[PDB]
A paper describes a structure:
In this work, we have obtained a double mutant form (His165Ala/Arg240His) to investigate the effect of the combining these mutations. The structure of this variant was solved with high resolution (1.3 Å), and analysis showed a continuous chain of water molecules from the enzyme surface to the Cu2 ion, whereas in the SgfSLwt the water chain was interrupted by the side group of Arg 240. Moreover, the water molecule closest to His 240 forms hydrogen bonds with this residue and with Asp 108, which is impossible in the SgfSLwt structure due to the side-chain of Arg 240. Substitution of Arg 240 to His leads to the interaction of polar amino acids (Asp 108 and some others) in the T2 tunnel with water molecules directly, and not through an intermediary (Arg 240). Due to the high resolution in the structure of the double mutant His165Ala/Arg240His, it was possible to identify almost two thousand water molecules. Increased amounts of water molecules allowed us to more accurately analyze the effect of amino acids in the T2 and T3 tunnels on the SgfSL functioning. The double mutant His165Ala/Arg240H retained an increased residual reaction rate at slightly acidic and neutral conditions. The catalytic efficiencies of double-mutant variants His165Ala/Met199Gly and His165Ala/Arg240His toward ABTS and 2.6-DMP are nearly identical to that observed with single-mutant form His165Ala. In the present study, the His165Ala/Met199Gly mutant retained practically the same high resistance to azide ions as His165Ala, and the resistance of His165Ala/Arg240His variant was 3-fold higher than that of the wild type laccase. Based on the high-resolution structure and biochemical data, we propose that the transfer of protons to the TNC clarifies the role of the water molecules chain located in the T2 tunnel of laccase structures, and the removal of water as a reaction product can occur through the T3 tunnel but not the T2.
Author numbering:
A (entry chain B), B (entry chain C): 41 to 317
C (entry chain A): 40 to 317
The structure:
């Protein structure tokens, strides 16, 4: 199962809302904001019009990485493209396919693992908004990219995973053989290293080698810093079997302070050998 | 147009000089030192003889990354390849084309985005010299590489850009459609993440995909540490239009403290929409 | 030195965890010969390795590997009850596989790469104390046809140390001009680092050398790394640069200043190293 060629013009509503404990999040439905924000998926060539509403009492913005946007959708104070309290704005994201330019150079397409976040809450860099939870994933697919059975987003935000209390995962479940996609985003002040037990991926656009000629390093550990994003697909349990497979930041004190979760890979009967919570 | 094949013997004079406020810099002519130092450009195969003079009252050196040099041009005190106050020395850098070794393996060429810096001021690692401004860019081009309309060098040195006071850019100007080359160098104590608004590049040698078979990740954000260097070319405003396009370190406190500048992309008439200083 | 053959052998080795002087701990293949870093394990894709492991210490220890195939019983974690109690024995099994085309039409990557093993239970359930103490080592998995080196050297940036050594004590490595030298670079602990070698450069890809004229990988001499990262490469000693005492170091300025530096001593065939004067 593979992504089709893109070129659809899509529309969605998005809201920025306050959540419990001083947090803030994005959502597609009023009153249902989440941290991380909703996953937005596009095929190269698609256009997305985000009909955005700020329900909070502070100005907020939406800034996206990687995609094509004009200055009016930059989402910064510099370009007066933030949204006043209670205000509305349509942010527009475009994407393009790769292709040969007339001068013979190759223009890269938009495809990749990307993300969106606030750029105006607290500081002109969005330090408050990002700390509070205003971030989410974007995936742009190229025609023919393999589609996963499930997608999970892991954000290292300062010393938290997904703004959760320490030592609370999140955990993600799969069955042996599932094609599982991970989107990995980092935000805030610190560098991290992301590691998965029992699984590995290629350090390239899709996380999978294109074939026998792709020299990309195969890895299970990767250094990342604020606003980095990457992603990959794995076959759950491939060559290793079912089990509670931990993922964690590998900076030692970060793991000791709770930047750890479980990739729970189940047998067909739904059980997980050796896992006794 | 495009870079030709190299193989010329080139020469330049270089001086290390004190600048205002305890700073130090390299320059090609006496009294003309700059931070960053002068851009050196070579084609693979070229040899460069750097006729160097230390005009300061403390020893200094010149050490280069990536290029070929004999141990006598290492630029360290350990083999006495530094330059005493008032002294002169010729440092020689060579470069080579790619090609197959007699052992059957492929030898990479010298081409890339590189840099030179001091190795003896303050400590035998050059900590004081680098802090003071003794660093600059070197580009080595491969035959057939596309040539840019302009080149700009951005150095994250500790918590400054190009040793400038916080919140002073620098800014760079272009017109929509210009082919703009960025050289990005990091120095000092801290990791950083370089981000550009409105533009992106391939994480490979040139910043441009070689064609449809290149699997390199396309990015707009990249983690870097002391002495890392990379570069890329972008088409100014491609798919996004004119405007003041922010670049910054994405480590949140670094952006907030002033590691931010503007890529000012003008319409053909010279105006920048939505921008007034 | 030739090229790696196709794998598929079942191999066995004894490994011991032992205390070393000064609160340290290391792995070894023979009792009383533990080292930091631990012994280099080399496998060809398809090989299986049974590590007959014995913990000779008075505290629990484990063995956890990156990159290779292992079942949950060889995870080497307390949460999977695959640690080794004091005085205990356990067989840890690592498997490896070749690349190939899957049933779903996609390409499955092989196990080949520069990997590493380390403790996961000493001090904390992340192995923080064991890693600090020295319980880490390299493991290389080769693909059929990979070029073999004349020598392999392992450089571990563990916190503010290289290979747990006292500051300003190297290590140094020797080669002759033209030798094919393999470096395995591992990082552990709390800090990011940047590894730099004077006079030498490599491709930022699986093997450290470009596969040919179509490989677009960046060529570098400086690389940022963080805890549990591993990479490796092969260089031709002195290629285009000649003999000399070629420094390698972390390029984070305070780290170099505190002594995270060593020497790659490249000699001419007659043994000379121009200008070397320690
Ligand atoms: Cu920004
Ligand atoms: Cu972390
Ligand atoms: Cu692991
Ligand atoms: Cu951003
Ligand atoms: Cu150095
Ligand atoms: Cu920074
Ligand atoms: Cu941005
Ligand atoms: Cu350097
Ligand atoms: Cu672990
Ligand atoms: Cu370091
Ligand atoms: Cu150097
Ligand atoms: Cu690990």
């Amino acid at each position: 199962g593979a992504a089709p060629a893109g070129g659809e013009v899509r529309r969605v509503t998005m809201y920025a809302e306050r959540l419990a404990g001083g947090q803030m999040g994005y959502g597609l439905e009023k009153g249902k904001a989440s941290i991380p924000g909703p996953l937005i998926e596009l095929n190269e060539g698609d256009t997305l019009h985000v009909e955005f509403e700020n329900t909070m009492d502070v100005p907020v913005s939406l800034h996206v990485h990687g995609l094509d946007y004009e200055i009016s959708s930059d989402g910064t104070k510099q370009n007066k493209s933030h949204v006043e309290p209670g205000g509305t704005r349509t942010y527009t994201w475009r994407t393009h396919e790769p292709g040969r330019r007339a001068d013979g150079t190759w223009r890269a397409g938009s495809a990749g693992y990307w993300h969106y976040h606030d750029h105006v809450v607290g500081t002109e860099a969005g330090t408050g908004g990002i700390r509070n939870g205003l971030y989410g994933p974007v995936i742009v697919r190229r025609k023919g990219d393999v589609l996963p059975d499930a997608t999970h987003t892991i954000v290292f935000n300062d010393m938290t995973i997904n703004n959760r209390p320490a030592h609370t995962g999140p955990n993600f479940e799969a069955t042996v053989g599932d094609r599982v996609e991970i989107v990995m985003i980092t935000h805030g002040e610190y560098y991290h290293t992301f590691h998965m037990h029992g699984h590995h991926w290629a350090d390239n656009r899709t996380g999978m080698l294109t074939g026998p000629d792709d020299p990309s390093q195969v890895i299970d550990n990767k250094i990342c810093g604020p606003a980095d994003s990457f992603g990959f697909q794995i076959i759950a349990g491939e060559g290793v079997g079912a089990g509670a497979w931990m993922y964690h930041c590998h900076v030692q004190s970060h793991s000791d302070m709770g930047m750890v979760g479980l990739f729970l890979v189940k047998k067909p009967d739904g059980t997980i050998p050796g896992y006794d919570p």
